[PDB]
Amino acid sequence: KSLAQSWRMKDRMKTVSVALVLCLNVGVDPPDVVKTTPCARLECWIDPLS
Amino acid sequence: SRAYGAMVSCHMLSELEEVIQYKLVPERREIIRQIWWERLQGCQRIVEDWQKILMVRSLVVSPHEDMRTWLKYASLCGKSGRLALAHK
Amino acid sequence: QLAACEATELLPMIPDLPADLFTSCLTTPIKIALRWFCMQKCVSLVPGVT
């Protein structure tokens, strides 16, 4: 007797499009976070301030 | 200089230890031969002493597998005035 | 939903890392995975790896 074979992907979804919302406002820091003098700056492997 | 004779016995004892490694460790062989070669040149150029030492090494290295030892050996026999042995 | 932090937490300000640390992990793992490897105590085991 064949068992209930439940290995198939009963759905193949696909990510059709992408929205890249980037709120950087490069330069001016927001009021919340006071940043350090050296600080973590790299953004997608780019120094924005350069 | 009187202690030298005994020193050669310890040379041969510790060389016999490096025949045990040589028969067990194929990866260590060419290092051992080089060690062996460098060691013999610090040792004195008397023909008896060399013969003793080479017989030990002959437990696992035929004379064809290391010429330079045996030519230098033959050369000592020539310089020391024992050409019969040098010939053999 | 994927989110960089728990509600109380703040993102790290550490000058060695990117600001974009989470996005960087999700989207360029091998790049931060190697940079992170070089910041740990386990680098002592491989000298000449800056």
Add this chain to the structure above:
Amino acid sequence: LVASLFRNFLLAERIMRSYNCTPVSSPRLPPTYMHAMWQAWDLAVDICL
């Protein structure tokens, strides 16, 4: 894309943990940071570079 994001999310979970950050996912995953397989990654990287 989802599979790539979650594969790479497991690395985020491990890395960010070492800086007082816990990433969050909506279909919540159980904590993988201490899986043995990460020791295999460490060694693999080490030997490679």
Add this chain to the structure above:
Amino acid sequence: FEIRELAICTVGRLSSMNPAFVMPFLRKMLIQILTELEHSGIGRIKEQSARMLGHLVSNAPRLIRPYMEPILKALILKLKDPNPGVINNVLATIGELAQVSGLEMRKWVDELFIIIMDMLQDSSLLAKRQVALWTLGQLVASTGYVVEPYRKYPTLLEVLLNFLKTEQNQG
């Protein structure tokens, strides 16, 4: 600790059988051992740690060959610190690495030779002259560093023919 020693010997032996599990875990252990060595400021923990690193080097040599330069710097650094059992176990490990690697550590021989010849002489940092001599044996043996020691350290023949006419141990 005795069980710990006994397990790491056993696990090291299986690192050829199933390296995928054992080699990652023994690497993790190696790191911990070297942390306890360097960062614990305690005689006993450092003493045990060296002892343990002895057993790792000997039983899992494949794992340890790539990490020989780190381990050896960590161990030489303990010998150049200003407890007897740490130095005795640190020397017993250096002797075991020599045996594992070889030529691969021919750079470090002249460093360790200075260190050990300082210790063969002098009962101020009185380690076991037994193990000093044992590890010195192993460097000269494995690394293949012969006859040069009599030039570079001319007192070696005055030092070593002194132990044959001073100390009362057979070993």
Add this chain to the structure above:
Amino acid sequence: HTMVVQAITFIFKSLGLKCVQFLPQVMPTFLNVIRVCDGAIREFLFQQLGMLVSFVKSHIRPYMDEIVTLMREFWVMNTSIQSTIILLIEQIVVALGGEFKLYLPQLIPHMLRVFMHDNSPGRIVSIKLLAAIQLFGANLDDYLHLLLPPIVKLFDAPEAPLPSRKAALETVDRLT
């Protein structure tokens, strides 16, 4: 010495995170005062450095190596300065958070000595130090094999007093 620092601490608390500006002026002097001052005040300064660090939080990073060196020097088996410094560690751990694992290895030798030989009445210098170790969090990963045996020896020792044993057990609870 004293009243100056009661102000400087009050100044930083009243400012908020805008006090960070003043750090490079304040700190180098403030640390050198701790190195030089005459005994009676050093417990007090270390209390206030702790306050300083809690306000400034992660902007203390650049002066941290000096701060640790200071602690390392003035940690003794003396009960008085230990409660003070152990409190100053708790304030450095929350301040740095993830960056504390760089400095923890300097401090470990002293912490392992605290458990080994604590002559404190009811082992309160041990109990206080357990409460700090609870805050360390994932900093403790690379050093757990060093810290853990002493903590375990603490709750299995029958000679040791009950508070110090619950304190040890509760810690292993948290660290889990």
